[PDB]
Structure 1
């Protein structure tokens, strides 16, 4: 599309998210979600092909259903109390409806099915936006109403998300589906700590966003969308593959990397509330994410796969466009564990 129109649409997406984040009226939050959904569809469909169109319609149907149930929950809450302010939910049925709507907006299990297909259908830039920016508004709304969530439903959906992400990532050779399942598992980790501490949720979201931005930018730099295509990168730019390997090790929660900070903290917080079994199962299940990260690292940088002759021509050329903040994203996603006590800034 025209660059002016693209910039306007991106600004509209961000403005819808910010309208959700700054408003105290339920109708304005709904309007922010509507504006975000309206501006999001062209961004997914920017490169026109049947796959992108299919992904856009799937995303539209899912988000429209979620927004309809969100409006229903708002109306029920207003019926049982003449309130429009986003606070305590005042009704269990309305709160269950709101939780389910926000879960489908986020892609938590069992509403996870659309995330892998939408991510596979769209390009890498649209996938970056969808997996990083499109999580802020529902998580902020969940943080604002955390004191009213039924912990049983929230914890059930979080544990299901962790399990589903871990199991679904094992079967994937497409990198975008791997990212989608990783996102589902990280969303489960984020939402398993909402009932106890929203600061932990925000810290996990920040760390995950940094890591996802770094990995998506590394995938864009080495324009690969499959495992075998990524296995050719060492013969053109081995530095990119080494950086990606360290980032993948960080994403697996291995200390002393940055990705260890959230789980650690979350586990600690859960233990402070006499919750022992669930964090144990959560770490056991995150082992699966680590396994398929390690498989990608094996195929990418720790071994050398066969190349092709036409790669020689590619040796004579350099990337014309360089993404700023990529080095900062890599450093922030690998080496911020010693600065862990900074979380008291209520990030």
Structure 2
């Protein structure tokens, strides 16, 4: 694909997301979603192969179904209220349709399978863009319409997302599938805290985006897509493996790393609303995410797996391309716990 075409497709995806985030009209929000999907599909299919084609097909089908449900919700809300402005929806059925459509777009359980399937199908850069941006937009819409979200349905989907992400990531060995299940679990956390504090939702979104960017940039640097492929990186550049081990510890929520701040603030906020069973279950379920993070860390950094013979030539050569802002992502994803009270600025 031509570089100009690639950059204009990326700019069109970002334009669609910005249209969603700045529009006050439901029709314009739907237009933004449609533009985002339309420009996103070729980005997934950039590196042509059967896996990329299948991932793009599944993602397109899921997003088209979600967009149809979202438009139906918009029309139903218009019927009972005659309003197009994005505010508290005036019909419970329209709200249920909108919530299910946005959950399907975000990949929340039980609409999750496409997330690991597409993430394994597509390359590392495509997966990074997918996770980050395509979680950024629907969560913006949900934060806008939070005051009419049904707490029971939202919390049920969030808990299902957390459990399913933990179990799937526990079973998987492929790095992209592990990242997808981690994304599912973090989406569960954020949507669980959504009906109480959209500021906490945004804080968790920022921390998750930073950690995911750092992890995907490290994976791109190591050029590893499986566990065994990552197990050879210690013999070529052990710094990358150490930084990735620290990032993995952060993603599990271990103090005093950055990953503990979202869980801590979400638990506090949800406890303020006289909810204890849900925060306790959400905290206890994250141990599965921590377990498969630790299993990945054992293979890559804390131990030394066998290597091969051409790794000598790999030693002789040097990494040419540079991914700027990677050190900043590594710092911000591990060492921003003391700066927690900035969430008021985020407010």
| Structures share fold, TM-score greater than 0.5 | yes
CA distance in 2, matches of 1:144, 1:133: 17
CA deviation vs aligned residue, 1:93-131 (integer Å, no higher than 9, x gap): 000000000000000000001000100000000000001
CA distance in 2, matches of 1:135, 1:160: 17
Aligned-residue offset at 1:198: 0.2
CA distance in 2, matches of 1:194, 1:158: 10
Aligned-residue offset at 1:137: 1.2
Partner of 2:315: 315
Aligned-residue offset at 1:163: 0.3
CA deviation vs aligned residue, 1:3-53 (integer Å, no higher than 9, x gap): 000010000000000000000000000000000000000000000000000
Aligned-residue offset at 1:133: 1.1
Partner of 1:106: 106
CA deviation vs aligned residue, 1:144-203 (integer Å, no higher than 9, x gap): 110001100000000000000001111111000000000000000000011110000000
Secondary structure of 1:13's partner? helix
Aligned-residue offset at 1:288: 0.4
CA deviation vs aligned residue, 1:188-241 (integer Å, no higher than 9, x gap): 000001111000000000000000000000000000000000000000000000
Tell me how many residue pairs correspond in the alignment: 347
Aligned-residue offset at 1:319: 0.8
CA distance in 2, matches of 1:129, 1:312: 33
Partner of 2:196: 196
CA distance in 1, matches of 2:305, 2:136: 39
TM-score (norm 1): 1.00
CA deviation vs aligned residue, 1:81-103 (integer Å, no higher than 9, x gap): 10000001000000000000000
CA distance in 1, matches of 2:135, 2:309: 43
Secondary structure of 2:171's partner? coil
Secondary structure of 1:17's partner? helix
Aligned-residue offset at 1:333: 0.1
CA distance in 2, matches of 1:346, 1:80: 35
- RMSD between superposed Cα atoms in Å: 0.5
Aligned-residue offset at 1:310: 1.0
> Which blocks of at least 5 consecutive residues in structure 1 are unaligned?
none
Aligned-residue offset at 1:346: 2.2
Matches within 5 A, 1:142-221: 142-221=142-221
Aligned-residue offset at 1:136: 1.3
CA distance in 2, matches of 1:137, 1:297: 31
CA deviation vs aligned residue, 1:42-71 (integer Å, no higher than 9, x gap): 000000000000000000000000000000
CA distance in 1, matches of 2:123, 2:306: 26
CA distance in 1, matches of 2:247, 2:209: 13
Secondary structure of 2:333's partner? helix
Partner of 1:26: 26
Partner of 2:72: 72
Secondary structure of 1:315's partner? helix
